[PDB]
Amino acid sequence: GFKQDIATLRGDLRTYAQDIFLAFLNKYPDEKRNFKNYVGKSDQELKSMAKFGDHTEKVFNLMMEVADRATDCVPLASDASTLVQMKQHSGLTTGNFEKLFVALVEYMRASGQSFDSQSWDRFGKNLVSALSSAGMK
Ligand code: HEM
Ligand SMILES: Oc1ccc(Cl)cc1Cl
């Protein structure tokens, strides 16, 4: 289920973080303009960039903590507030996060592993709602 999925993902953290982020960037190539020097590079070129692995892991580490602190796939409002106020997230909108969770859910459904994809979809929708309530446009 959702709780065990967190453990599954944390158990192969680097690989899942990179695969899911790349799935997002490839499903929605427009989203690359939020990042520096990701344009014009294949997945393997991105994975070999300095910062890329470090960044993707730090994002994914926090996403798993937010999922782990949720009850019934409802994230804590305080976690949403932290995500809204981060300087690195200024100018983002909830649409950026909705697209990330669309890509994550699609990746889980296409995977050979048995993820609770509908719970991740609900979690993403509840996170989007919490981000709005916390002030994200
Ligand atoms: C629940 C989802 C997310 C979480 C937990 C999260 C968390 C984080 C964290 C922890 C960092 C700091 C990384 C570091 O300094 O090494 C970061 C940076 C950043 N995030 Fe988010 N993030 C999320 C979603 C997104 C989305 C959807 C976007 C845009 C589509 C985004 C864009 C950025 C950018 C542009 C930065 C700074 C650029 C950089 O890391 O060099 N994030 N995020
Ligand atoms: O910037 C990111 C890094 C890793 C993941 Cl999974 C998502 C995002 Cl937006």
PDB file of N, CA and C in Angstrom, residues 30-119:
ATOM      1  N   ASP A  30       8.178  21.228 -21.362  1.00  0.00           N
ATOM      2  CA  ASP A  30       8.122  22.639 -20.985  1.00  0.00           C
ATOM      3  C   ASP A  30       8.656  22.870 -19.577  1.00  0.00           C
ATOM      4  N   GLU A  31       8.529  21.877 -18.695  1.00  0.00           N
ATOM      5  CA  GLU A  31       8.921  22.042 -17.303  1.00  0.00           C
ATOM      6  C   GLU A  31      10.424  22.208 -17.118  1.00  0.00           C
ATOM      7  N   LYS A  32      11.231  21.887 -18.131  1.00  0.00           N
ATOM      8  CA  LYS A  32      12.674  22.066 -18.010  1.00  0.00           C
ATOM      9  C   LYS A  32      13.076  23.531 -17.860  1.00  0.00           C
ATOM     10  N   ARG A  33      12.242  24.474 -18.307  1.00  0.00           N
ATOM     11  CA  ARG A  33      12.638  25.875 -18.204  1.00  0.00           C
ATOM     12  C   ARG A  33      12.687  26.383 -16.766  1.00  0.00           C
ATOM     13  N   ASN A  34      12.200  25.604 -15.799  1.00  0.00           N
ATOM     14  CA  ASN A  34      12.364  25.925 -14.387  1.00  0.00           C
ATOM     15  C   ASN A  34      13.742  25.558 -13.857  1.00  0.00           C
ATOM     16  N   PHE A  35      14.565  24.877 -14.646  1.00  0.00           N
ATOM     17  CA  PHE A  35      15.851  24.381 -14.184  1.00  0.00           C
ATOM     18  C   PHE A  35      16.967  24.921 -15.068  1.00  0.00           C
ATOM     19  N   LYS A  36      18.184  24.880 -14.539  1.00  0.00           N
ATOM     20  CA  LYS A  36      19.343  25.454 -15.211  1.00  0.00           C
ATOM     21  C   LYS A  36      20.101  24.372 -15.970  1.00  0.00           C
ATOM     22  N   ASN A  37      20.306  24.602 -17.269  1.00  0.00           N
ATOM     23  CA  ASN A  37      21.151  23.757 -18.112  1.00  0.00           C
ATOM     24  C   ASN A  37      20.650  22.319 -18.230  1.00  0.00           C
ATOM     25  N   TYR A  38      19.335  22.107 -18.189  1.00  0.00           N
ATOM     26  CA  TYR A  38      18.782  20.795 -18.507  1.00  0.00           C
ATOM     27  C   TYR A  38      18.407  20.653 -19.981  1.00  0.00           C
ATOM     28  N   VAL A  39      18.400  21.755 -20.730  1.00  0.00           N
ATOM     29  CA  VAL A  39      17.988  21.749 -22.129  1.00  0.00           C
ATOM     30  C   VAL A  39      19.022  21.023 -22.985  1.00  0.00           C
ATOM     31  N   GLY A  40      18.542  20.284 -23.987  1.00  0.00           N
ATOM     32  CA  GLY A  40      19.420  19.699 -24.984  1.00  0.00           C
ATOM     33  C   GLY A  40      20.232  18.514 -24.519  1.00  0.00           C
ATOM     34  N   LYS A  41      19.800  17.837 -23.459  1.00  0.00           N
ATOM     35  CA  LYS A  41      20.562  16.736 -22.896  1.00  0.00           C
ATOM     36  C   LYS A  41      19.679  15.508 -22.777  1.00  0.00           C
ATOM     37  N   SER A  42      20.245  14.353 -23.118  1.00  0.00           N
ATOM     38  CA  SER A  42      19.553  13.098 -22.907  1.00  0.00           C
ATOM     39  C   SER A  42      19.547  12.756 -21.417  1.00  0.00           C
ATOM     40  N   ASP A  43      18.757  11.740 -21.075  1.00  0.00           N
ATOM     41  CA  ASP A  43      18.633  11.328 -19.680  1.00  0.00           C
ATOM     42  C   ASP A  43      19.992  11.002 -19.080  1.00  0.00           C
ATOM     43  N   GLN A  44      20.845  10.302 -19.835  1.00  0.00           N
ATOM     44  CA  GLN A  44      22.139   9.904 -19.282  1.00  0.00           C
ATOM     45  C   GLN A  44      23.053  11.105 -19.089  1.00  0.00           C
ATOM     46  N   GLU A  45      22.972  12.083 -19.991  1.00  0.00           N
ATOM     47  CA  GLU A  45      23.744  13.307 -19.814  1.00  0.00           C
ATOM     48  C   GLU A  45      23.289  14.060 -18.569  1.00  0.00           C
ATOM     49  N   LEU A  46      21.972  14.126 -18.337  1.00  0.00           N
ATOM     50  CA  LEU A  46      21.459  14.765 -17.127  1.00  0.00           C
ATOM     51  C   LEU A  46      21.943  14.041 -15.880  1.00  0.00           C
ATOM     52  N   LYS A  47      21.833  12.716 -15.865  1.00  0.00           N
ATOM     53  CA  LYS A  47      22.230  11.952 -14.689  1.00  0.00           C
ATOM     54  C   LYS A  47      23.707  12.111 -14.358  1.00  0.00           C
ATOM     55  N   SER A  48      24.532  12.464 -15.335  1.00  0.00           N
ATOM     56  CA  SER A  48      25.954  12.656 -15.096  1.00  0.00           C
ATOM     57  C   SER A  48      26.315  14.095 -14.759  1.00  0.00           C
ATOM     58  N   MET A  49      25.344  15.005 -14.753  1.00  0.00           N
ATOM     59  CA  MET A  49      25.619  16.373 -14.348  1.00  0.00           C
ATOM     60  C   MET A  49      25.849  16.417 -12.847  1.00  0.00           C
ATOM     61  N   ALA A  50      26.822  17.241 -12.474  1.00  0.00           N
ATOM     62  CA  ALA A  50      26.912  17.734 -11.128  1.00  0.00           C
ATOM     63  C   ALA A  50      25.588  18.386 -10.774  1.00  0.00           C
ATOM     64  N   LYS A  51      25.331  18.431  -9.495  1.00  0.00           N
ATOM     65  CA  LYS A  51      24.012  18.708  -8.938  1.00  0.00           C
ATOM     66  C   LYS A  51      22.838  17.775  -9.260  1.00  0.00           C
ATOM     67  N   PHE A  52      22.750  17.169 -10.452  1.00  0.00           N
ATOM     68  CA  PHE A  52      21.505  16.489 -10.823  1.00  0.00           C
ATOM     69  C   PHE A  52      21.109  15.422  -9.806  1.00  0.00           C
ATOM     70  N   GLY A  53      22.017  14.491  -9.506  1.00  0.00           N
ATOM     71  CA  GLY A  53      21.685  13.443  -8.555  1.00  0.00           C
ATOM     72  C   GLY A  53      21.440  13.991  -7.163  1.00  0.00           C
ATOM     73  N   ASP A  54      22.253  14.965  -6.750  1.00  0.00           N
ATOM     74  CA  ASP A  54      22.107  15.566  -5.428  1.00  0.00           C
ATOM     75  C   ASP A  54      20.765  16.277  -5.292  1.00  0.00           C
ATOM     76  N   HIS A  55      20.396  17.064  -6.310  1.00  0.00           N
ATOM     77  CA  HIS A  55      19.111  17.762  -6.326  1.00  0.00           C
ATOM     78  C   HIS A  55      17.948  16.779  -6.306  1.00  0.00           C
ATOM     79  N   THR A  56      17.925  15.844  -7.262  1.00  0.00           N
ATOM     80  CA  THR A  56      16.801  14.916  -7.345  1.00  0.00           C
ATOM     81  C   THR A  56      16.632  14.135  -6.050  1.00  0.00           C
ATOM     82  N   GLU A  57      17.741  13.737  -5.421  1.00  0.00           N
ATOM     83  CA  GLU A  57      17.612  13.012  -4.157  1.00  0.00           C
ATOM     84  C   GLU A  57      17.047  13.899  -3.050  1.00  0.00           C
ATOM     85  N   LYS A  58      17.511  15.143  -2.951  1.00  0.00           N
ATOM     86  CA  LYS A  58      17.002  16.009  -1.892  1.00  0.00           C
ATOM     87  C   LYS A  58      15.513  16.290  -2.068  1.00  0.00           C
ATOM     88  N   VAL A  59      15.064  16.497  -3.307  1.00  0.00           N
ATOM     89  CA  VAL A  59      13.637  16.699  -3.543  1.00  0.00           C
ATOM     90  C   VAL A  59      12.861  15.452  -3.136  1.00  0.00           C
ATOM     91  N   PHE A  60      13.328  14.291  -3.599  1.00  0.00           N
ATOM     92  CA  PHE A  60      12.627  13.043  -3.344  1.00  0.00           C
ATOM     93  C   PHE A  60      12.649  12.687  -1.862  1.00  0.00           C
ATOM     94  N   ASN A  61      13.765  12.968  -1.181  1.00  0.00           N
ATOM     95  CA  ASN A  61      13.837  12.734   0.260  1.00  0.00           C
ATOM     96  C   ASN A  61      12.704  13.464   0.965  1.00  0.00           C
ATOM     97  N   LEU A  62      12.496  14.732   0.604  1.00  0.00           N
ATOM     98  CA  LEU A  62      11.448  15.506   1.256  1.00  0.00           C
ATOM     99  C   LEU A  62      10.064  15.039   0.825  1.00  0.00           C
ATOM    100  N   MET A  63       9.882  14.704  -0.459  1.00  0.00           N
ATOM    101  CA  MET A  63       8.584  14.187  -0.877  1.00  0.00           C
ATOM    102  C   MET A  63       8.203  12.947  -0.079  1.00  0.00           C
ATOM    103  N   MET A  64       9.167  12.051   0.161  1.00  0.00           N
ATOM    104  CA  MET A  64       8.855  10.858   0.936  1.00  0.00           C
ATOM    105  C   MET A  64       8.538  11.199   2.384  1.00  0.00           C
ATOM    106  N   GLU A  65       9.198  12.213   2.953  1.00  0.00           N
ATOM    107  CA  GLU A  65       8.863  12.617   4.315  1.00  0.00           C
ATOM    108  C   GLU A  65       7.454  13.190   4.391  1.00  0.00           C
ATOM    109  N   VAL A  66       7.066  14.005   3.402  1.00  0.00           N
ATOM    110  CA  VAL A  66       5.713  14.560   3.377  1.00  0.00           C
ATOM    111  C   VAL A  66       4.693  13.437   3.239  1.00  0.00           C
ATOM    112  N   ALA A  67       4.981  12.458   2.381  1.00  0.00           N
ATOM    113  CA  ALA A  67       4.078  11.319   2.254  1.00  0.00           C
ATOM    114  C   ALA A  67       4.023  10.511   3.548  1.00  0.00           C
ATOM    115  N   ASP A  68       5.172  10.342   4.216  1.00  0.00           N
ATOM    116  CA  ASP A  68       5.236   9.566   5.453  1.00  0.00           C
ATOM    117  C   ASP A  68       4.509  10.256   6.603  1.00  0.00           C
ATOM    118  N   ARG A  69       4.476  11.596   6.613  1.00  0.00           N
ATOM    119  CA  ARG A  69       3.784  12.319   7.676  1.00  0.00           C
ATOM    120  C   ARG A  69       2.291  12.456   7.422  1.00  0.00           C
ATOM    121  N   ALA A  70       1.816  12.066   6.241  1.00  0.00           N
ATOM    122  CA  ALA A  70       0.403  12.153   5.913  1.00  0.00           C
ATOM    123  C   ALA A  70      -0.405  11.125   6.700  1.00  0.00           C
ATOM    124  N   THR A  71      -1.695  11.410   6.847  1.00  0.00           N
ATOM    125  CA  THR A  71      -2.672  10.435   7.318  1.00  0.00           C
ATOM    126  C   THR A  71      -3.668  10.221   6.191  1.00  0.00           C
ATOM    127  N   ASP A  72      -3.910   8.958   5.831  1.00  0.00           N
ATOM    128  CA  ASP A  72      -4.829   8.633   4.734  1.00  0.00           C
ATOM    129  C   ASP A  72      -4.549   9.472   3.493  1.00  0.00           C
ATOM    130  N   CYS A  73      -3.263   9.644   3.174  1.00  0.00           N
ATOM    131  CA  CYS A  73      -2.828  10.367   1.981  1.00  0.00           C
ATOM    132  C   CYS A  73      -3.130  11.859   2.043  1.00  0.00           C
ATOM    133  N   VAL A  74      -3.407  12.393   3.230  1.00  0.00           N
ATOM    134  CA  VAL A  74      -3.628  13.824   3.418  1.00  0.00           C
ATOM    135  C   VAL A  74      -2.352  14.404   4.026  1.00  0.00           C
ATOM    136  N   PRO A  75      -1.630  15.276   3.325  1.00  0.00           N
ATOM    137  CA  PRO A  75      -0.389  15.815   3.888  1.00  0.00           C
ATOM    138  C   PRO A  75      -0.679  16.840   4.973  1.00  0.00           C
ATOM    139  N   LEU A  76       0.322  17.061   5.827  1.00  0.00           N
ATOM    140  CA  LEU A  76       0.222  18.091   6.860  1.00  0.00           C
ATOM    141  C   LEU A  76       0.231  19.479   6.229  1.00  0.00           C
ATOM    142  N   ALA A  77      -0.640  20.361   6.729  1.00  0.00           N
ATOM    143  CA  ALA A  77      -0.637  21.739   6.242  1.00  0.00           C
ATOM    144  C   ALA A  77       0.726  22.395   6.438  1.00  0.00           C
ATOM    145  N   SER A  78       1.426  22.056   7.527  1.00  0.00           N
ATOM    146  CA  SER A  78       2.731  22.661   7.766  1.00  0.00           C
ATOM    147  C   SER A  78       3.745  22.248   6.710  1.00  0.00           C
ATOM    148  N   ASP A  79       3.645  21.015   6.192  1.00  0.00           N
ATOM    149  CA  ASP A  79       4.519  20.610   5.100  1.00  0.00           C
ATOM    150  C   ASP A  79       4.208  21.410   3.841  1.00  0.00           C
ATOM    151  N   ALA A  80       2.921  21.633   3.560  1.00  0.00           N
ATOM    152  CA  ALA A  80       2.558  22.445   2.404  1.00  0.00           C
ATOM    153  C   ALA A  80       3.087  23.864   2.551  1.00  0.00           C
ATOM    154  N   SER A  81       2.939  24.452   3.743  1.00  0.00           N
ATOM    155  CA  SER A  81       3.451  25.799   3.976  1.00  0.00           C
ATOM    156  C   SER A  81       4.951  25.881   3.713  1.00  0.00           C
ATOM    157  N   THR A  82       5.714  24.884   4.171  1.00  0.00           N
ATOM    158  CA  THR A  82       7.151  24.885   3.905  1.00  0.00           C
ATOM    159  C   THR A  82       7.438  24.890   2.409  1.00  0.00           C
ATOM    160  N   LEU A  83       6.692  24.092   1.643  1.00  0.00           N
ATOM    161  CA  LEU A  83       6.925  24.020   0.202  1.00  0.00           C
ATOM    162  C   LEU A  83       6.560  25.328  -0.489  1.00  0.00           C
ATOM    163  N   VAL A  84       5.509  26.006  -0.019  1.00  0.00           N
ATOM    164  CA  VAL A  84       5.116  27.277  -0.621  1.00  0.00           C
ATOM    165  C   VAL A  84       6.177  28.343  -0.380  1.00  0.00           C
ATOM    166  N   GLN A  85       6.745  28.381   0.831  1.00  0.00           N
ATOM    167  CA  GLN A  85       7.619  29.477   1.238  1.00  0.00           C
ATOM    168  C   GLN A  85       9.065  29.316   0.787  1.00  0.00           C
ATOM    169  N   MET A  86       9.467  28.121   0.351  1.00  0.00           N
ATOM    170  CA  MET A  86      10.831  27.920  -0.112  1.00  0.00           C
ATOM    171  C   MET A  86      11.161  28.901  -1.231  1.00  0.00           C
ATOM    172  N   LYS A  87      12.299  29.587  -1.093  1.00  0.00           N
ATOM    173  CA  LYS A  87      12.716  30.543  -2.115  1.00  0.00           C
ATOM    174  C   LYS A  87      12.866  29.879  -3.473  1.00  0.00           C
ATOM    175  N   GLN A  88      13.288  28.616  -3.495  1.00  0.00           N
ATOM    176  CA  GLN A  88      13.450  27.917  -4.762  1.00  0.00           C
ATOM    177  C   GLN A  88      12.127  27.648  -5.462  1.00  0.00           C
ATOM    178  N   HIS A  89      11.002  27.836  -4.771  1.00  0.00           N
ATOM    179  CA  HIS A  89       9.674  27.611  -5.322  1.00  0.00           C
ATOM    180  C   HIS A  89       8.916  28.893  -5.621  1.00  0.00           C
ATOM    181  N   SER A  90       9.545  30.056  -5.473  1.00  0.00           N
ATOM    182  CA  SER A  90       8.862  31.295  -5.816  1.00  0.00           C
ATOM    183  C   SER A  90       8.505  31.297  -7.297  1.00  0.00           C
ATOM    184  N   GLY A  91       7.299  31.757  -7.608  1.00  0.00           N
ATOM    185  CA  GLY A  91       6.847  31.765  -8.980  1.00  0.00           C
ATOM    186  C   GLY A  91       6.255  30.468  -9.500  1.00  0.00           C
ATOM    187  N   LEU A  92       6.454  29.333  -8.822  1.00  0.00           N
ATOM    188  CA  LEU A  92       5.771  28.113  -9.236  1.00  0.00           C
ATOM    189  C   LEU A  92       4.279  28.228  -8.943  1.00  0.00           C
ATOM    190  N   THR A  93       3.487  27.415  -9.629  1.00  0.00           N
ATOM    191  CA  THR A  93       2.067  27.308  -9.325  1.00  0.00           C
ATOM    192  C   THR A  93       1.730  25.851  -9.040  1.00  0.00           C
ATOM    193  N   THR A  94       0.510  25.623  -8.546  1.00  0.00           N
ATOM    194  CA  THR A  94       0.120  24.255  -8.227  1.00  0.00           C
ATOM    195  C   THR A  94       0.086  23.374  -9.461  1.00  0.00           C
ATOM    196  N   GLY A  95      -0.056  23.963 -10.653  1.00  0.00           N
ATOM    197  CA  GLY A  95      -0.009  23.174 -11.869  1.00  0.00           C
ATOM    198  C   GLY A  95       1.307  22.446 -12.059  1.00  0.00           C
ATOM    199  N   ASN A  96       2.422  23.055 -11.640  1.00  0.00           N
ATOM    200  CA  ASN A  96       3.704  22.357 -11.724  1.00  0.00           C
ATOM    201  C   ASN A  96       3.680  21.080 -10.889  1.00  0.00           C
ATOM    202  N   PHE A  97       3.084  21.151  -9.697  1.00  0.00           N
ATOM    203  CA  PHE A  97       3.032  19.993  -8.811  1.00  0.00           C
ATOM    204  C   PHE A  97       2.035  18.960  -9.309  1.00  0.00           C
ATOM    205  N   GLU A  98       0.889  19.408  -9.832  1.00  0.00           N
ATOM    206  CA  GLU A  98      -0.074  18.469 -10.390  1.00  0.00           C
ATOM    207  C   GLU A  98       0.556  17.654 -11.504  1.00  0.00           C
ATOM    208  N   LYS A  99       1.324  18.312 -12.379  1.00  0.00           N
ATOM    209  CA  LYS A  99       1.966  17.600 -13.477  1.00  0.00           C
ATOM    210  C   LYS A  99       3.003  16.615 -12.963  1.00  0.00           C
ATOM    211  N   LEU A 100       3.735  16.983 -11.902  1.00  0.00           N
ATOM    212  CA  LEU A 100       4.689  16.043 -11.322  1.00  0.00           C
ATOM    213  C   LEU A 100       3.987  14.777 -10.853  1.00  0.00           C
ATOM    214  N   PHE A 101       2.834  14.917 -10.208  1.00  0.00           N
ATOM    215  CA  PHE A 101       2.151  13.728  -9.719  1.00  0.00           C
ATOM    216  C   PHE A 101       1.458  12.939 -10.824  1.00  0.00           C
ATOM    217  N   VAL A 102       1.000  13.606 -11.888  1.00  0.00           N
ATOM    218  CA  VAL A 102       0.529  12.872 -13.067  1.00  0.00           C
ATOM    219  C   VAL A 102       1.635  11.971 -13.603  1.00  0.00           C
ATOM    220  N   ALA A 103       2.845  12.516 -13.727  1.00  0.00           N
ATOM    221  CA  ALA A 103       3.954  11.735 -14.264  1.00  0.00           C
ATOM    222  C   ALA A 103       4.357  10.620 -13.311  1.00  0.00           C
ATOM    223  N   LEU A 104       4.369  10.905 -12.006  1.00  0.00           N
ATOM    224  CA  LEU A 104       4.723   9.889 -11.026  1.00  0.00           C
ATOM    225  C   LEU A 104       3.735   8.727 -11.066  1.00  0.00           C
ATOM    226  N   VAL A 105       2.437   9.035 -11.112  1.00  0.00           N
ATOM    227  CA  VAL A 105       1.422   7.982 -11.123  1.00  0.00           C
ATOM    228  C   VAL A 105       1.526   7.139 -12.390  1.00  0.00           C
ATOM    229  N   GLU A 106       1.747   7.787 -13.535  1.00  0.00           N
ATOM    230  CA  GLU A 106       1.912   7.056 -14.786  1.00  0.00           C
ATOM    231  C   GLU A 106       3.131   6.145 -14.731  1.00  0.00           C
ATOM    232  N   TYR A 107       4.231   6.638 -14.163  1.00  0.00           N
ATOM    233  CA  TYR A 107       5.422   5.810 -13.992  1.00  0.00           C
ATOM    234  C   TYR A 107       5.120   4.589 -13.137  1.00  0.00           C
ATOM    235  N   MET A 108       4.394   4.786 -12.035  1.00  0.00           N
ATOM    236  CA  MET A 108       4.073   3.663 -11.159  1.00  0.00           C
ATOM    237  C   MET A 108       3.199   2.638 -11.874  1.00  0.00           C
ATOM    238  N   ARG A 109       2.230   3.101 -12.666  1.00  0.00           N
ATOM    239  CA  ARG A 109       1.378   2.161 -13.383  1.00  0.00           C
ATOM    240  C   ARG A 109       2.152   1.386 -14.439  1.00  0.00           C
ATOM    241  N   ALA A 110       3.167   1.997 -15.048  1.00  0.00           N
ATOM    242  CA  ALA A 110       3.953   1.306 -16.064  1.00  0.00           C
ATOM    243  C   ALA A 110       5.048   0.421 -15.476  1.00  0.00           C
ATOM    244  N   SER A 111       5.331   0.551 -14.184  1.00  0.00           N
ATOM    245  CA  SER A 111       6.412  -0.176 -13.541  1.00  0.00           C
ATOM    246  C   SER A 111       6.059  -1.654 -13.398  1.00  0.00           C
ATOM    247  N   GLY A 112       7.098  -2.484 -13.277  1.00  0.00           N
ATOM    248  CA  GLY A 112       6.881  -3.876 -12.922  1.00  0.00           C
ATOM    249  C   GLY A 112       6.562  -4.102 -11.459  1.00  0.00           C
ATOM    250  N   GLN A 113       6.820  -3.109 -10.612  1.00  0.00           N
ATOM    251  CA  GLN A 113       6.564  -3.176  -9.182  1.00  0.00           C
ATOM    252  C   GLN A 113       5.107  -2.815  -8.898  1.00  0.00           C
ATOM    253  N   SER A 114       4.546  -3.367  -7.812  1.00  0.00           N
ATOM    254  CA  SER A 114       3.106  -3.239  -7.517  1.00  0.00           C
ATOM    255  C   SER A 114       2.799  -2.091  -6.547  1.00  0.00           C
ATOM    256  N   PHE A 115       2.756  -0.877  -7.086  1.00  0.00           N
ATOM    257  CA  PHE A 115       2.563   0.336  -6.307  1.00  0.00           C
ATOM    258  C   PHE A 115       1.072   0.586  -6.156  1.00  0.00           C
ATOM    259  N   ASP A 116       0.693   1.284  -5.079  1.00  0.00           N
ATOM    260  CA  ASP A 116      -0.698   1.699  -4.872  1.00  0.00           C
ATOM    261  C   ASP A 116      -0.890   3.033  -5.592  1.00  0.00           C
ATOM    262  N   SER A 117      -1.041   2.937  -6.915  1.00  0.00           N
ATOM    263  CA  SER A 117      -1.002   4.127  -7.762  1.00  0.00           C
ATOM    264  C   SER A 117      -2.150   5.080  -7.452  1.00  0.00           C
ATOM    265  N   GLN A 118      -3.341   4.544  -7.176  1.00  0.00           N
ATOM    266  CA  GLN A 118      -4.470   5.414  -6.867  1.00  0.00           C
ATOM    267  C   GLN A 118      -4.254   6.192  -5.575  1.00  0.00           C
ATOM    268  N   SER A 119      -3.519   5.628  -4.612  1.00  0.00           N
ATOM    269  CA  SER A 119      -3.210   6.400  -3.407  1.00  0.00           C
ATOM    270  C   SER A 119      -2.239   7.533  -3.710  1.00  0.00           C
TER     271      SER A 119
END
